[PDB]
Design a protein around this ligand. Structure first.
Ligand SMILES: [Mg+2]
Ligand SMILES: [Mg+2]
Ligand SMILES: [Mg+2]
Ligand SMILES: [Mg+2]
Ligand SMILES: [Mg+2]
Length: 80
RNA sequence: GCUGAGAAGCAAAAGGAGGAAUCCGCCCGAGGAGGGGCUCGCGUCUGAUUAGCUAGUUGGUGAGGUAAUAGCUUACCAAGGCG
């Protein structure tokens, strides 16, 4: 579901999907996490999509998790 | 919106950020406040052993000019203006 999805940009390339999921699991249950990687170089593009089970947890995650520091890097948390 | 009794005629733009939401801008009107331009009453030194001064000068029309009123300009008419 697209309204239940949250785009996270400016993620450090050293950030594992486990830490992203841990910081964004505080706002609610996460149905899925997909990190976007370059097809050719296999390297992390620095952004990912997170599907939450509910839309209330999606909006509560968009509001308070913006500018949040993850591994020494401020990340941009918005809607997909 | 501007010209014009009207008929009509005439006039604008710019993108840059951000992954998107969005932000800072851009053009045309209509207001607000502030900042300037003008006009006028009043007040604003000494000399009479300084007494007459002024002719775009004082007013009128027509054309121009100014962001705007105005001899601001110019031509014509009148002979005023200050003491
Ligand atoms: Mg044109
Ligand atoms: Mg940039
Ligand atoms: Mg862009
Ligand atoms: Mg004094
Ligand atoms: Mg003359």
């Amino acid at each position: 579901e697209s309204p239940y999805k949250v785009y996270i940009g400016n993620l450090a390339k050293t950030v594992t999907n486990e830490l992203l999921k841990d910081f964004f699991s505080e706002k609610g249950k996460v149905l899925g996490a997909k990190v976007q990687r370059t097809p050719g170089t296999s390297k992390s593009n620095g952004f990912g999509f997170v599907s939450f089970s509910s839309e209330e947890e999606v909006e509560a995650a968009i509001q308070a998790l913006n500018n949040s520091v993850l591994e020494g890097q401020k990340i941009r948390v918005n809607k997909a």
